[PDB]
Amino acid sequence: KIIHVTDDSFDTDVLKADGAILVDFWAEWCGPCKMIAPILDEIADEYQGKLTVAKLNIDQNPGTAPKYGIRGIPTLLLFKNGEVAATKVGALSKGQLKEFLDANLA
């Protein structure tokens, strides 16, 4: 359900994707990241059909993050039509994520 993205499949899975894609940039050592992982799993269920959730481990895929000016994690990028539509840095509750999503999905 949650796309496992890599440095090699980013361009095709995200840039050429047709729809709204939410990309989660994390790393095993990033606590705040591990804190919102459960929330993404649930968001994928509540937004099935109008949103696709993907995740990119920066340690294993150290190339993509820099091209998008990502200065730290956790950081979420909402791609729309092949381009960044909205950005969100830091951990957040279930509510803050839904409000952010509802407002930028319309």
Q: Write down the domain spans for the chain.
A: 1-106
- Secondary-structure class of domain 1-106 per CATH: alpha beta
Active site residues: 30, 33
How determined?
A: X-ray
State the sign of the Cα–Cα–Cα–Cα dihedral 65, 26, 51, 105: negative
Residue 72 burial by Cβ neighbours in a 10 Å radius (0-12, 13-18, 19+):
exposed
Tokens at residue 74, please? 């956790």
Q: In 39-67, which positions are buried (b, 16+ CB within 10 angstroms) versus exposed (e)?
A: bbeebbeebeeebbbbbbbbeebeebbee
